[PDB]
Amino acid sequence: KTEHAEINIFSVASGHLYERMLNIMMASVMHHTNHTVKFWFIEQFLSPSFKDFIPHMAAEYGFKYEMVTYKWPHWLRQQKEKQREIWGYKILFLDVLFPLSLDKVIFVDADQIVRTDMYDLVEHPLDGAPYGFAPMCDSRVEMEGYRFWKTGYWANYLKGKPYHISALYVVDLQRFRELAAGDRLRQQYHALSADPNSLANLDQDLPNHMQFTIPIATLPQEWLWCETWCSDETLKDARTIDLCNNPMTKEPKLDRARRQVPEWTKYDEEIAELARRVREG
Numbered sequence: 001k002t003e004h005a006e007i008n009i010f011s012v013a014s015g016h017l018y019e020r021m022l023n024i025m026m027a028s029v030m031h032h033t034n035h036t037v038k039f040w041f042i043e044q045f046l047s048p049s050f051k052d053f054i055p056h057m058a059a060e061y062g063f064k065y066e067m068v069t070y071k072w073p074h075w076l077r078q079q080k081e082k083q084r085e086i087w088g089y090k091i092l093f094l095d096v097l098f099p100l101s102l103d104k105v106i107f108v109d110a111d112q113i114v115r116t117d118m119y120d121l122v123e124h125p126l127d128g129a130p131y132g133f134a135p136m137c138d139s140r141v142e143m144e145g146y147r148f149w150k151t152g153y154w155a156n157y158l159k160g161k162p163y164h165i166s167a168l169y170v171v172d173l174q175r176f177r178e179l180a181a182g183d184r185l186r187q188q189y190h191a192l193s194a195d196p197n198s199l200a201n202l203d204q205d206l207p208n209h210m211q212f213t214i215p216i217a218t219l220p221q222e223w224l225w226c227e228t229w230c231s232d233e234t235l236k237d238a239r240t241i242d243l244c245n246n247p248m249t250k251e252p253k254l255d256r257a258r259r260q261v262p263e264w265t266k267y268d269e270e271i272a273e274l275a276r277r278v279r280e281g
Protein backbone atom coordinates (compact mmCIF):
# COMPACT_ATOMS: atom_id res chain seq x y z
CA LYS A 1 0.00 0.00 0.00
CA THR A 2 0.87 3.80 -0.04
CA GLU A 3 3.62 4.42 -2.78
CA HIS A 4 3.56 0.66 -3.64
CA ALA A 5 2.42 -0.68 -7.12
CA GLU A 6 -1.27 -1.61 -7.50
CA ILE A 7 -0.39 -5.23 -8.55
CA ASN A 8 2.60 -7.00 -6.92
CA ILE A 9 3.57 -10.42 -8.24
CA PHE A 10 6.38 -12.77 -7.26
CA SER A 11 7.59 -15.90 -9.00
CA VAL A 12 10.40 -18.43 -8.79
CA ALA A 13 12.34 -19.70 -11.80
CA SER A 14 15.38 -21.94 -11.99
CA GLY A 15 16.79 -22.86 -15.40
CA HIS A 16 17.03 -21.24 -18.87
CA LEU A 17 13.70 -22.85 -19.90
CA TYR A 18 11.80 -21.53 -16.85
CA GLU A 19 13.41 -18.09 -17.25
CA ARG A 20 12.27 -18.01 -20.92
CA MET A 21 8.71 -18.77 -19.69
CA LEU A 22 9.02 -16.23 -16.82
CA ASN A 23 9.60 -13.36 -19.28
CA ILE A 24 6.52 -14.58 -21.26
CA MET A 25 4.43 -14.66 -18.03
CA MET A 26 5.43 -11.07 -17.23
CA ALA A 27 4.64 -9.87 -20.81
CA SER A 28 1.19 -11.56 -20.56
CA VAL A 29 0.41 -9.75 -17.26
CA MET A 30 1.34 -6.32 -18.68
CA HIS A 31 -0.65 -6.84 -21.93
CA HIS A 32 -3.79 -7.37 -19.77
CA THR A 33 -3.65 -4.48 -17.29
CA ASN A 34 -3.28 -0.70 -17.15
CA HIS A 35 -2.70 -0.80 -13.37
CA THR A 36 0.84 -0.31 -12.05
CA VAL A 37 2.76 -3.59 -11.60
CA LYS A 38 5.86 -4.55 -9.62
CA PHE A 39 7.49 -7.98 -10.06
CA TRP A 40 9.47 -9.50 -7.18
CA PHE A 41 12.15 -12.13 -7.82
CA ILE A 42 13.73 -14.78 -5.61
CA GLU A 43 17.22 -13.65 -6.63
CA GLN A 44 19.55 -16.59 -5.85
CA PHE A 45 17.96 -19.03 -8.34
CA LEU A 46 18.20 -16.75 -11.39
CA SER A 47 20.97 -16.72 -14.02
CA PRO A 48 23.20 -13.64 -14.43
CA SER A 49 21.82 -13.10 -17.97
CA PHE A 50 18.21 -13.03 -16.74
CA LYS A 51 19.02 -10.53 -13.99
CA ASP A 52 20.89 -8.38 -16.56
CA PHE A 53 17.88 -8.45 -18.95
CA ILE A 54 15.20 -7.56 -16.29
CA PRO A 55 15.82 -3.71 -16.59
CA HIS A 56 15.26 -3.98 -20.36
CA MET A 57 11.98 -5.89 -19.79
CA ALA A 58 11.00 -3.29 -17.14
CA ALA A 59 11.57 -0.32 -19.46
CA GLU A 60 9.85 -1.99 -22.47
CA TYR A 61 6.77 -3.24 -20.62
CA GLY A 62 6.60 -0.44 -18.02
CA PHE A 63 6.88 -2.30 -14.71
CA LYS A 64 8.92 -1.90 -11.53
CA TYR A 65 10.88 -4.80 -9.99
CA GLU A 66 12.84 -5.85 -6.92
CA MET A 67 15.28 -8.69 -6.22
CA VAL A 68 14.81 -10.40 -2.83
CA THR A 69 17.70 -12.46 -1.32
CA TYR A 70 16.52 -14.27 1.83
CA LYS A 71 18.72 -16.85 3.63
CA TRP A 72 17.18 -20.15 4.79
CA PRO A 73 17.17 -20.04 8.64
CA HIS A 74 19.70 -22.45 10.20
CA TRP A 75 17.14 -23.91 12.63
CA LEU A 76 14.66 -24.81 9.86
CA ARG A 77 14.95 -28.24 8.18
CA GLN A 78 16.72 -27.73 4.81
CA GLN A 79 15.82 -29.39 1.48
CA LYS A 80 18.76 -31.05 -0.28
CA GLU A 81 16.79 -31.34 -3.59
CA LYS A 82 16.82 -27.98 -5.49
CA GLN A 83 13.15 -28.39 -6.57
CA ARG A 84 12.05 -28.78 -2.95
CA GLU A 85 14.23 -25.84 -1.80
CA ILE A 86 12.53 -23.67 -4.47
CA TRP A 87 9.11 -24.91 -3.26
CA GLY A 88 10.17 -23.89 0.27
CA TYR A 89 10.85 -20.35 -1.00
CA LYS A 90 7.28 -20.18 -2.41
CA ILE A 91 5.48 -21.02 0.86
CA LEU A 92 7.68 -20.76 4.00
CA PHE A 93 8.86 -17.12 3.92
CA LEU A 94 5.82 -15.05 2.82
CA ASP A 95 6.11 -12.73 5.86
CA VAL A 96 9.90 -12.14 5.55
CA LEU A 97 10.51 -11.84 1.78
CA PHE A 98 8.54 -8.62 1.38
CA PRO A 99 8.66 -5.25 3.16
CA LEU A 100 6.20 -4.54 5.99
CA SER A 101 4.80 -1.70 3.79
CA LEU A 102 3.54 -4.22 1.13
CA ASP A 103 -0.07 -5.23 1.87
CA LYS A 104 -0.59 -7.88 -0.83
CA VAL A 105 1.39 -10.05 -3.19
CA ILE A 106 0.38 -12.70 -5.69
CA PHE A 107 2.46 -15.75 -6.62
CA VAL A 108 2.18 -16.50 -10.39
CA ASP A 109 4.04 -19.57 -11.71
CA ALA A 110 6.83 -18.91 -14.27
CA ASP A 111 5.11 -21.19 -16.81
CA GLN A 112 1.75 -19.33 -16.64
CA ILE A 113 0.01 -17.32 -19.33
CA VAL A 114 -2.20 -14.53 -17.97
CA ARG A 115 -5.41 -13.52 -19.87
CA THR A 116 -6.94 -11.16 -17.29
CA ASP A 117 -6.32 -7.95 -15.37
CA MET A 118 -4.44 -9.18 -12.27
CA TYR A 119 -5.93 -6.22 -10.28
CA ASP A 120 -9.20 -8.31 -10.29
CA LEU A 121 -7.32 -10.76 -8.01
CA VAL A 122 -6.03 -7.90 -5.81
CA GLU A 123 -9.69 -6.82 -5.38
CA HIS A 124 -11.09 -10.33 -4.83
CA PRO A 125 -12.66 -10.65 -1.36
CA LEU A 126 -10.83 -13.11 0.92
CA ASP A 127 -13.37 -13.02 3.82
CA GLY A 128 -10.56 -12.83 6.41
CA ALA A 129 -8.33 -15.53 4.84
CA PRO A 130 -4.62 -14.71 4.75
CA TYR A 131 -4.39 -16.29 1.27
CA GLY A 132 -6.47 -17.54 -1.66
CA PHE A 133 -5.77 -20.43 -4.06
CA ALA A 134 -7.78 -21.98 -6.93
CA PRO A 135 -9.02 -25.55 -6.49
CA MET A 136 -7.74 -28.44 -8.57
CA CYS A 137 -10.21 -28.94 -11.46
CA ASP A 138 -12.46 -32.01 -11.43
CA SER A 139 -13.86 -31.23 -14.95
CA ARG A 140 -11.52 -33.55 -16.96
CA VAL A 141 -13.26 -36.80 -15.98
CA GLU A 142 -10.70 -38.99 -17.85
CA MET A 143 -7.97 -37.95 -15.39
CA GLU A 144 -9.79 -39.13 -12.20
CA GLY A 145 -7.28 -41.94 -11.54
CA TYR A 146 -4.49 -39.34 -11.26
CA ARG A 147 -6.41 -37.13 -8.72
CA PHE A 148 -4.50 -38.47 -5.68
CA TRP A 149 -6.37 -36.01 -3.40
CA LYS A 150 -9.75 -37.71 -4.11
CA THR A 151 -8.78 -41.04 -2.38
CA GLY A 152 -6.60 -42.32 0.52
CA TYR A 153 -5.12 -40.12 3.24
CA TRP A 154 -6.03 -36.78 1.41
CA ALA A 155 -9.73 -37.69 0.96
CA ASN A 156 -9.99 -38.63 4.65
CA TYR A 157 -8.02 -35.59 5.84
CA LEU A 158 -9.81 -32.97 3.69
CA LYS A 159 -13.39 -33.88 4.79
CA GLY A 160 -14.79 -32.49 1.52
CA LYS A 161 -12.57 -29.38 1.49
CA PRO A 162 -10.97 -28.55 -1.86
CA TYR A 163 -7.41 -29.60 -2.64
CA HIS A 164 -5.92 -26.35 -4.02
CA ILE A 165 -3.31 -25.97 -6.79
CA SER A 166 -0.19 -23.93 -5.82
CA ALA A 167 0.46 -22.46 -9.30
CA LEU A 168 -1.24 -19.18 -8.37
CA TYR A 169 -2.15 -17.62 -5.02
CA VAL A 170 -2.98 -14.23 -3.58
CA VAL A 171 -1.53 -13.41 -0.14
CA ASP A 172 -3.04 -10.60 1.95
CA LEU A 173 0.31 -9.86 3.68
CA GLN A 174 -1.35 -7.61 6.30
CA ARG A 175 -3.66 -10.48 7.34
CA PHE A 176 -0.92 -13.13 6.95
CA ARG A 177 1.29 -11.03 9.37
CA GLU A 178 -1.74 -10.35 11.66
CA LEU A 179 -2.21 -14.14 11.95
CA ALA A 180 1.47 -15.31 12.45
CA ALA A 181 0.78 -17.63 9.47
CA GLY A 182 4.45 -17.58 8.46
CA ASP A 183 5.73 -18.67 11.90
CA ARG A 184 3.02 -21.37 12.05
CA LEU A 185 3.69 -22.67 8.50
CA ARG A 186 7.47 -22.87 9.26
CA GLN A 187 6.80 -24.72 12.55
CA GLN A 188 4.37 -27.30 11.02
CA TYR A 189 6.67 -27.79 8.00
CA HIS A 190 9.65 -28.32 10.38
CA ALA A 191 7.76 -30.99 12.36
CA LEU A 192 6.17 -32.72 9.32
CA SER A 193 9.41 -32.82 7.29
CA ALA A 194 11.09 -35.05 9.96
CA ASP A 195 9.42 -37.84 7.83
CA PRO A 196 11.16 -37.58 4.40
CA ASN A 197 8.07 -39.08 2.67
CA SER A 198 5.76 -36.25 3.98
CA LEU A 199 4.87 -33.13 1.93
CA ALA A 200 5.57 -34.78 -1.46
CA ASN A 201 4.34 -31.60 -3.25
CA LEU A 202 5.83 -29.24 -0.59
CA ASP A 203 4.42 -25.89 -1.86
CA GLN A 204 0.93 -27.36 -2.42
CA ASP A 205 0.56 -29.93 0.39
CA LEU A 206 1.53 -27.55 3.22
CA PRO A 207 -1.27 -24.91 2.71
CA ASN A 208 -3.81 -27.69 1.95
CA HIS A 209 -2.75 -29.45 5.20
CA MET A 210 -3.03 -26.21 7.21
CA GLN A 211 -6.37 -25.00 5.73
CA PHE A 212 -8.43 -25.84 8.87
CA THR A 213 -6.35 -23.40 11.01
CA ILE A 214 -4.81 -21.02 8.38
CA PRO A 215 -7.86 -20.44 6.17
CA ILE A 216 -7.73 -20.54 2.39
CA ALA A 217 -10.18 -18.42 0.38
CA THR A 218 -11.06 -20.86 -2.48
CA LEU A 219 -10.73 -18.74 -5.62
CA PRO A 220 -13.20 -19.05 -8.53
CA GLN A 221 -12.16 -22.06 -10.66
CA GLU A 222 -11.61 -19.78 -13.65
CA TRP A 223 -8.53 -18.27 -11.89
CA LEU A 224 -6.41 -21.32 -12.86
CA TRP A 225 -6.88 -23.63 -15.84
CA CYS A 226 -4.48 -26.50 -16.60
CA GLU A 227 -5.17 -28.97 -19.41
CA THR A 228 -4.16 -31.95 -17.27
CA TRP A 229 -7.12 -31.48 -14.89
CA CYS A 230 -9.47 -29.07 -16.64
CA SER A 231 -11.89 -29.67 -19.51
CA ASP A 232 -11.50 -28.04 -22.96
CA GLU A 233 -14.98 -26.46 -22.50
CA THR A 234 -13.81 -24.41 -19.51
CA LEU A 235 -10.73 -22.93 -21.29
CA LYS A 236 -12.76 -20.00 -22.76
CA ASP A 237 -13.56 -18.84 -19.20
CA ALA A 238 -9.92 -19.19 -17.93
CA ARG A 239 -8.34 -16.03 -16.52
CA THR A 240 -4.86 -17.70 -16.39
CA ILE A 241 -3.43 -20.86 -17.93
CA ASP A 242 -0.85 -23.01 -16.15
CA LEU A 243 1.30 -25.43 -18.17
CA CYS A 244 1.15 -28.07 -15.48
CA ASN A 245 2.68 -31.53 -15.96
CA ASN A 246 0.45 -34.23 -17.42
CA PRO A 247 1.26 -37.60 -15.77
CA MET A 248 -0.62 -39.47 -18.52
CA THR A 249 1.03 -38.02 -21.66
CA LYS A 250 4.33 -36.70 -20.27
CA GLU A 251 4.29 -34.19 -23.27
CA PRO A 252 7.28 -31.76 -23.29
CA LYS A 253 6.91 -28.25 -21.80
CA LEU A 254 7.48 -26.19 -25.00
CA ASP A 255 5.24 -28.55 -27.02
CA ARG A 256 2.37 -28.00 -24.45
CA ALA A 257 2.92 -24.22 -24.59
CA ARG A 258 2.83 -23.89 -28.41
CA ARG A 259 -0.10 -26.29 -28.81
CA GLN A 260 -2.39 -25.01 -26.04
CA VAL A 261 -1.91 -21.25 -26.08
CA PRO A 262 -2.16 -19.44 -29.46
CA GLU A 263 -0.58 -16.22 -28.11
CA TRP A 264 2.46 -18.04 -26.61
CA THR A 265 4.57 -17.79 -29.83
CA LYS A 266 3.60 -14.11 -30.10
CA TYR A 267 4.99 -13.34 -26.58
CA ASP A 268 8.06 -15.56 -27.16
CA GLU A 269 8.86 -13.80 -30.48
CA GLU A 270 8.18 -10.34 -28.93
CA ILE A 271 10.68 -10.94 -26.11
CA ALA A 272 13.25 -12.37 -28.59
CA GLU A 273 12.67 -9.22 -30.76
CA LEU A 274 13.34 -7.03 -27.67
CA ALA A 275 16.53 -9.07 -26.95
CA ARG A 276 17.82 -8.51 -30.54
CA ARG A 277 16.99 -4.77 -30.23
CA VAL A 278 19.05 -4.45 -27.00
CA ARG A 279 21.95 -6.57 -28.41
CA GLU A 280 22.43 -4.35 -31.50
CA GLY A 281 21.79 -1.10 -29.54
Ligand SMILES: Oc1ccc(CN2CCOCC2)c2cccnc12
Binds near residue numbers: 154197208
Ligand atom coordinates in the same frame (compact mmCIF):
# COMPACT_ATOMS: atom_id res chain seq x y z
O1 LIG B 1 -2.17 -33.28 6.02
C1 LIG B 1 -1.17 -33.87 5.32
C2 LIG B 1 0.12 -33.42 5.54
C3 LIG B 1 1.20 -34.05 4.88
C4 LIG B 1 0.99 -35.11 4.02
C5 LIG B 1 2.15 -35.91 3.50
N1 LIG B 1 2.04 -37.35 3.99
C6 LIG B 1 2.88 -38.25 3.14
C7 LIG B 1 2.69 -39.70 3.60
O2 LIG B 1 3.03 -39.82 4.97
C8 LIG B 1 2.28 -38.99 5.82
C9 LIG B 1 2.44 -37.50 5.43
C10 LIG B 1 -0.33 -35.54 3.73
C11 LIG B 1 -0.64 -36.56 2.78
C12 LIG B 1 -1.93 -36.92 2.59
C13 LIG B 1 -2.94 -36.27 3.34
N2 LIG B 1 -2.73 -35.32 4.20
C14 LIG B 1 -1.41 -34.94 4.39
Ligand SMILES: *[C@@H]1O[C@H](CO)[C@@H](O)[C@H](O)[C@H]1NC(C)=O
Binds near residue numbers: 033034
Ligand atom coordinates in the same frame (compact mmCIF):
# COMPACT_ATOMS: atom_id res chain seq x y z
C1 LIG C 1 -5.97 0.15 -21.11
O1 LIG C 1 -6.22 1.46 -21.60
C2 LIG C 1 -6.49 1.51 -23.01
C3 LIG C 1 -6.61 2.97 -23.38
O2 LIG C 1 -7.39 3.72 -22.45
C4 LIG C 1 -7.74 0.69 -23.32
O3 LIG C 1 -7.96 0.68 -24.73
C5 LIG C 1 -7.57 -0.73 -22.82
O4 LIG C 1 -8.77 -1.47 -23.02
C6 LIG C 1 -7.20 -0.73 -21.34
N1 LIG C 1 -6.96 -2.09 -20.86
C7 LIG C 1 -7.37 -2.52 -19.67
C8 LIG C 1 -7.03 -3.94 -19.33
O5 LIG C 1 -7.99 -1.80 -18.89
